Task: structure prediction
Amino acid sequence: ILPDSVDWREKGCVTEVKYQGSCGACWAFSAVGALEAQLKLKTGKLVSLSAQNLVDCSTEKYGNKGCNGGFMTTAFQYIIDNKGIDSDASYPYKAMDQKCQYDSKYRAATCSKYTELPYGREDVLKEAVANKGPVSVGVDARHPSFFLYRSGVYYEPSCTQNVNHGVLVVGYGDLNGKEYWLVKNSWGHNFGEEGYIRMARNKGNHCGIASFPSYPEIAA
Ligand SMILES: *[C@@](O)(C(=O)NCc1ccccc1)[C@H](C[C@@H]1CCNC1=O)NC(=O)[C@H](CC1CC1)n1cccc(NC(=O)OC(C)(C)C)c1=O
Result:
C-alpha cells in the first residue's frame, strides 16, 4: 500500500531550485534533478549536478539541441555512455550553448540505466515516486495560466497531453482532498510556490504529466 502523500524534500533528496533563464534547458534541469536524488540515496551526499554539462555535451548524438530543447531520457543515456556527469560546482550553468567541457576529474555522479514509465498511467507514476524517487516528466506548459501560477492545485481546462516542458515530480499529496503532483520547476525561486507547482493528479493525465515519465538509477 502506497503512502497517501510523499515529499522527497523531507528526505533530503532535492537540491535548491535553479533558474534556467533564457536558455531552453528545462530538460537538462529535469534530468539532473532526478539523478541528484539517486546520488543522495546511494552516497548520502546531496549535490547539484551540472545541467550545463548536459546542454554542452548531450547534443546531436542524443537528439538534443542545447538551449533549443532536448530529452531527459537521452540525457540519462549520455551520462551512461560518458561514464559520468560533473558537479554543478565544477561546471556551472551559463544559460548558453557551449563547447563540451566535461572532465572526469570533476565527476560527481554516474548512471547505470533509466526506466521509461508506461504512457498515461498515473498509478504507475505514483508507485515510482513513492518507491523509487523523483521522476522526470514532461508537461504541457504552453498556456498563460502556467506562467501566472502562484499557489494551490493547478488545473488548466485547455491543457493537452502533448508535452513541451521538462520538470521533476518530487512528491504527491492532496490539498483538502484535491489531489496533486508536487513539481520542481527550473524557473527560479520566485515562480509559483517558491519554485514549485502543485499540478492536478488523477484528473485524466492532466497536462500530460504522466505521458512521458522516466527515472535513472546508479549502480551500487
Ligand atoms: C523547456 O520547456 C524550457 O527550457 N522552457 C523554458 C524556455 C522556453 C523557451 C525559451 C527559453 C526557455 C524546453 C523549451 C523549448 C526549448 C526552447 N524552446 C522551447 O519551447 N522544452 C523542451 O526542451 C522540450 C522537452 C520535452 C519533454 C517535453 N522539448 C524537447 C525537444 C523539442 C521540443 N520542441 C520543439 O522542437 O518544438 C518545435 C516547435 C518543433 C521546434 C521541446 O519542447
